[PDB]
């Protein structure tokens, strides 16, 4: 009804998106790899430019999981009934080159599943 | 283990906080009243100033649920092992004056429950 879970696995590691509908608004939690976390949080509505918070990681640098959160936002923006919040934290120990390139097709694959679920479950009752 | 739910009810309406631990990081979803939603999203760590996104509501104005999200952030900041994300959407149809004043004691009551749970479940294994 108001909660769904989507997974995908390419190049030997998994990514998961957990979606929650609250009122007309959406919360999506994206994780994967060996160490799930919350690295970045992207915020948007259907007719608003997305904003992203990047949390600090180590050595003065910031988490780069916003590649995932910002791409999923662009893919699903047109379908938003209200606000949308996307958290992302994907990390694979000793990640490989083929694994890095698979991050974008995996985000698209989850985005497509989310979009299908939204069309089958109109947030308007 | 990694998920807990806290409720409180004062002046005849309820507020709920759902907490999720991901890695070392926290996601807290606060709702209540007749129409739960996601109005505002506050982001912080233990030694960082909090930032808040205010989503648009109606008539060019913005949701004011950040009163709740920003107060819960201040209450629990010292206890944070990593990043923290707090969403808030509380709305009561024809809210009353006693109900408005109860918003702050209710947020404190949830914050105290969250803090107790974090101390009993150290995010470090
Ligand atoms: Mn990260
Ligand atoms: Mn609101």
Author numbering:
A (entry chain A), B (entry chain A): -1 to 123
Article passage:
Despite multiple attempts, the crystal structure of LpdD in complex with prFMNH2 could not be determined, because of the difficulties associated with maintaining the strict anaerobic conditions required. However, LpdD crystals soaked with MnCl2 and prFMNH2 did reveal the presence of a metal ion in the electron density, coordinated by His35, His61, and Asp63 residues. Major conformational changes were observed when compared with the non–metal-bound apo-LpdD in the F53–I66 loop region, containing two of the three ligating residues. This region is highly conserved despite having no obvious structural role in the apo-LpdD, which may indicate Mn2+ binding could be relevant for activity, as is observed for UbiD enzymes. Structure elucidation reveals LpdD is similar in structure to a eukaryotic chaperone involved in 20S proteosome assembly, with a highly conserved region exposed at the protein surface. The latter includes a metal-binding site with possible relevance to function, with the conserved H35–H61–D63 providing a Mn2+-binding site. The coordination pattern allows a fourth nonprotein ligand to bind, possibly the prFMN phosphate when in complex with the cofactor, thus resembling the UbiD Mn2+-assisted prFMN binding. The presence of MnCl2 (Mn2+ is required for prFMN binding in UbiD but not UbiX) in the reconstitution buffer appears to have no noticeable effect on LpdD–prFMNH2 binding. Furthermore, WT LpdD prFMNH2 binding occurs in the absence of Mn2+, which suggests metal binding is not essential for activity. Given the LpdD conserved surface–exposed region largely consists of loop regions that are shown to alter conformation in response to either metal binding or single-site mutations, we suggest that the LpdD–prFMNH2 complex likely has a distinct conformation through induced fit binding, hindering accurate modeling of the complex on the basis of the non–cofactor-bound structures.
